[PDB]
């Protein structure tokens, strides 16, 4: 027996599968169980032998993909591709909710850097979604004392106390009095999607000289970051400005369209990293093209 567990951001599904079972068969069963149709955004995340977080290929069997061995196999049904604008592209409520929960968790886990002012505004939309309108009676002082509202990095510059924070969030909850639940989630996603680290797939790489760098893959192309600045790219490669991309084993090369510009060469720890980089490039480029036809 092959026990597998797939979690969405708010559901947990446990399946028994077979050695012949494909990721697509698992993917489609999760998808119709929760009733989602905007499937192009999503995938089945897992951790592999080496402790890398990657995505299941749906065309290959679940067993042939080096998934970490644990009695319940662990898959996270998650957004794998991110729209250029959530307002135009996330239609179903199930899609919007799953994006909202996933993005909020990443922000709360300090995986996406977020200024404190934006963080409190984000927290206010989250409480308007969960609690509905602030009501003077049923929401007496201290009603968010047990809610996880802000990322810890924001707390570490602790000019405010744990109670001063909640009072300022409370203030902004009041300003959202008319807002319905789904629109509250969408306003959260509208703000969150403009953070610089939002929707970026980060890969640890090195240049030819051995200097460590980051490689970002997002909806608009490729970015090179210095190892100690993951916010602002030092080189940017939008799709329209790339002549070709390539890899051979560990060596990866980006050639810009300029023609006088030199290629950018970087090196991955192993071939599977470069394969995963390219797969995300192909997925993001295709959605990019499909948005413009």
């Amino acid at each position: 027996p092959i026990n597998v567990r797939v979690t969405t951001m708010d559901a947990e599904l446990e399946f028994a599968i077979q050695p012949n079972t494909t990721g697509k068969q698992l993917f489609d069963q999760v998808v119709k169980t929760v009733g989602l149709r905007e499937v192009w955004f999503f995938g089945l995340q897992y951790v592999d032998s080496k402790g890398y977080s990657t995505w299941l290929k749906l065309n290959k069997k679940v067993t042939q993909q080096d998934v970490k061995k644990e009695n319940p196999l662990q898959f996270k049904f998650r957004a794998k591709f991110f729209p250029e604008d959530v307002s135009e592209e996330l239609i179903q409520e199930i899609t919007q909710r799953l994006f909202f929960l996933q993005v909020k968790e990443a922000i709360l886990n300090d995986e996406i850097y977020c200024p404190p002012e934006t963080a409190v505004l984000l927290a206010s939309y989250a409480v308007q979604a969960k609690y509905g309108d602030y009501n003077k009676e049923i929401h007496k002082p201290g009603y968010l004392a047990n809610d996880r509202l802000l990322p810890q990095r924001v707390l570490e510059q602790h000019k405010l106390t744990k109670e001063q924070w909640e009072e300022r969030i409370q203030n902004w909850h009041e300003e959202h009095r008319g807002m319905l639940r789904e629109d509250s989630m969408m306003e959260y996603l509208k703000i969150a999607q403009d953070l610089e680290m939002y929707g970026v797939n980060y890969f640890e790489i090195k240049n030819k000289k051995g200097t460590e760098l980051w490689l970002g893959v997002d909806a608009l192309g490729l970015n090179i970051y210095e190892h100690d600045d993951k916010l602002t790219p030092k080189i940017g490669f939008p799709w329209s400005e790339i002549r070709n991309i390539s890899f051979n084993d560990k060596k990866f090369v980006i050639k810009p369209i300029d023609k006088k510009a030199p290629d950018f060469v970087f090196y991955a720890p192993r071939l599977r990293i470069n394969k995963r980089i390219l797969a995300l490039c192909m997925g993001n480029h295709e959605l990019y093209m499909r948005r413009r036809k």
Binding site: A11, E12, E14, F15, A16, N20, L26, T33
Partner: peptide, 13 residues
């Protein structure tokens, strides 16, 4: 055909 069989669900609301 090797379809997965659901043996458990938890819904978190």
């Amino acid at each position: 055909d090797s379809e997965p069989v659901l043996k458990g669900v938890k819904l978190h609301y």
